[PDB]
């Protein structure tokens, strides 16, 4: 019976491959062949944020495109005013081992998590004037690798126990569990409508999950190593994954297979973070070679390099209005680029 | 100045946050970072109990005006290479292994836990992140190994062992096998201590090893090393 189930599974996988091949007549390199190239992209460092003393592991911008939050291994979650480099807040974390942080769309709450397997939500707007631990979510048996706010009360997180989770914050209970990944889920991205979300794990696969239904929609397998980053296209009909095989890959949800590959022979190091520009034409990816490349998402040709960090670029984000791109590295510095 | 009154007050608040961060960093930099590692039932529990007497578990204690933090990853059931780099820069790595494991095969199967501990030690010591971090090797359960070696010879673990079935010689052999797994002979040093269930010199040995590491790091900083 087990062998019959395995042969049914492999027949189904072959059917998936055949169906994907059938709906593949012209590549993205052929559709976007006569379009004008983006050209050389010159982005300069406008602000440098100092105050972190250990390697910085994550950051998130926020909807207002002015504030930002950064988490560092020195046990500090610092909320910066990017326009004036002022430190709006400095939260001392209970556990110094933080690897992810999220800033709520409303801005009233901020999230973090890490090796303590607990997602801590802090209330920034308190009548006491300080920042207090609003809630601690527990239940993941592995390290918390990513977290993203749906709203003030719902949060989606990914953990190293091959599991994603949707939590109701006021109750503190794990509302929904997303399972199916066979490797540690390293990053997740939320769709613009906050109805679906993609999660990339260490099994070299990405999965699309329906938030409301709680079940996986599609699985995309094009990478050859652990996927460290993921990010939707601005229209929510495609996404990009960076992995350890020194390649980025643009997949799309509605055709259900890979569209484009972003790789160069002179790059051997893996990708730590990716994000899309406001129009989606530029894909920014941070690498382990201390640099940050900017690729043409439509032509796959590299457009620029953001080389200003002295250590591994660990986190990278783009504002909602797209005005600037912020990169934080292991040298305890964030840099804003325009 | 073009700043408003509220802007100047915000800048003053930022400067206060800056000096508080500097004070916190000064306090934290005066503290020893120890990463506790080992196989299953290696003896990490008795080690942390001894240090207390004199996700991730943090153990803070004091000895000779030094503050020590041990980070026992322990029950972190995830493949290690995605978060081991978080521990790069620790003062030392305390690697605990049980001697009596030399003839025990229930690893999870049909292979010695001793060899699994050897492979874990090889992975940690020769890791790309811990090229200069020093290892403090703890060989626990010496008292029970004393009586176990008299019935099951060491050849159950090492087929090439030819020495006498004596505690000192076989223990030296095991220490030599662990030290040979070090490929960074020039950048890092391995400190070995032979501990038991009822000894109180373990914290003194950790103090000595940390002091030696501090001296070596200072010599590197001065350029004299």
């Amino acid at each position: 019976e087990l062998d019959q189930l395995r042969q049914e599974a492999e027949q189904l996988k072959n059917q998936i491959r055949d169906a994907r091949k059938a709906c593949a007549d012209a590549t993205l390199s052929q559709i976007t062949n006569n379009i004008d190239p983006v050209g050389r992209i010159q982005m300069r460092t406008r602000r440098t944020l100092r105050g972190h003393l250990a390697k910085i592991y994550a950051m998130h911008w926020g909807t207002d495109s002015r504030l930002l939050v950064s988490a560092s291994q020195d046990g500090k979650l610092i909320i910066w005013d990017s326009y004036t480099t002022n430190k709006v807040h400095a939260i001392p974390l209970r556990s110094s081992w933080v690897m992810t942080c999220a800033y709520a769309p409303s801005g009233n709450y901020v999230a973090c998590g890490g090796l303590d397997n607990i997602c801590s939500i802090y209330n920034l707007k308190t009548r006491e004037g300080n920042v207090r631990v609003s809630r601690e979510l527990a239940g993941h048996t592995g390290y918390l690798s990513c977290c993203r706010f749906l709203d003030d009360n719902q949060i989606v997180t990914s953990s190293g126990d091959t599991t994603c989770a949707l939590w109701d914050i006021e109750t503190g209970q794990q509302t929904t569990t997303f399972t199916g990944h066979t490797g540690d889920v390293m990053s997740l991205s939320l769709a613009p409508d906050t109805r679906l979300f993609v999660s990339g794990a260490c099994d070299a696969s990405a999965k699309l999950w329906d938030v409301r239904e709680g079940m996986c929609r599609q699985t995309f397998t094009g990478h050859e190593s652990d996927i460290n980053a993921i990010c939707f296209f601005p229209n929510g009909n495609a996404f990009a994954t960076g992995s350890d095989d020194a390649t980025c890959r643009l997949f799309d949800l509605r055709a259900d297979q890979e569209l484009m590959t972003y790789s160069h022979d002179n790059i051997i190091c893996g990708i730590t973070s990716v994000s899309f520009s406001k129009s989606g034409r530029l894909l920014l990816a941070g690498y382990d070679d201390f640099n940050c490349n900017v690729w043409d998402a439509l032509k796959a040709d590299r457009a620029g390099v953001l080389a200003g960090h002295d250590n591994r670029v660990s986190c990278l984000g783009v504002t909602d209005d797209g005005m600037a791109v912020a990169t934080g590295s292991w040298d305890s510095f964030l840099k804003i680029w325009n | 100045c073009t700043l408003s009154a509220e802007d100047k007050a915000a800048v003053e608040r930022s400067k206060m946050i800056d000096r508080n961060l500097r004070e916190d960093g000064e306090k934290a930099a005066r503290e020893v970072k120890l990463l506790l590692l080992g196989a299953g039932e290696s003896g990490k529990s008795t080690i942390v109990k001894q240090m207390k007497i004199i996700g991730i578990v943090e153990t803070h204690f004091t000895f000779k005006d030094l503050h020590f933090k041990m980070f026992d990853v322990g029950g972190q059931r995830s493949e290690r290479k995605k978060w081991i780099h978080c521990f790069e820069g620790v003062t030392a790595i305390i690697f605990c292994v049980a001697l009596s494991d030399y003839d025990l095969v229930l690893a999870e199967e049909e292979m010695n836990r001793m060899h699994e501990s050897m492979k874990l030690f090889d992975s940690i010591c020769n890791n790309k992140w811990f090229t200069d971090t020093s290892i403090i090797l703890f060989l626990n359960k010496k008292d029970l190994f004393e009586e176990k070696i008299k019935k099951s010879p060491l050849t159950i673990c090492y087929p090439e062992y030819a020495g006498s079935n004596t505690y000192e010689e076989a223990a030296a052999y095991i220490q030599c096998q662990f030290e040979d797994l070090n490929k960074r002979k020039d950048t890092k040093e391995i400190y070995t201590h032979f501990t038991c269930a009822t000894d109180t010199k373990n914290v003194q040995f950790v103090f000595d090893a940390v002091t030696d590491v501090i001296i070596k790091n200072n010599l590197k900083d001065c350029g004299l090393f």
Partner: single-chain antibody
Amino acid sequence: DVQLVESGGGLVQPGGSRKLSCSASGFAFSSFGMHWVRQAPEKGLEWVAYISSGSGTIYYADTVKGRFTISRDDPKNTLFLQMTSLRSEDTAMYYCVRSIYYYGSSPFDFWGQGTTLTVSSGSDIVMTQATSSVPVTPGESVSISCRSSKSLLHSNGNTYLYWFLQRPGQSPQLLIYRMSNLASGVPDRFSGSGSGTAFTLTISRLEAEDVGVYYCMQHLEYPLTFGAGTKLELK
């Protein structure tokens, strides 16, 4: 909740000295700047003194500079005002006001109950509230106007205008900060608008508890000045 108590007021002979203590509870006193504000018996508010968090910066009004000294003891969460050479014009209700300053913050958030002091017997922005009082009817719409001698709009785009309401027998309560934002706990009936040197505060479907004196404050140039106030009365 957060609460401030002022103590140390009473009958004082002219030229004497007096000590006022404001005790704070329910909030992080060390991280809040503190203001001493004065209201004469039949007059409006008048900013007196300010001490920042950590006592880094200290400011006084010109009428009280030199004689008055503002200080704070953070471990005891208390604020001190030492007054020397008291004049007959210093008799008033004194309020200690908490005020935190960061991006998006709401300064002058909470006001103390105030303590009564009874002394026995230029180049600053003038904020003008031309109308002394208006009669209103519950359920109607009323607009309170304000005018400034100098434009309150800064190069950063913020218009530093603050609106306060002082119900009879109670301390002033913040309604609008920076001319647009609504303070926490304030009903959405109050709306703040204006531009440059002209400002207005509009109340939609005013209720019975909206009766009081509305004060207009500026925060651009630091010698804070208040408006004369506009009293609302029922018919």
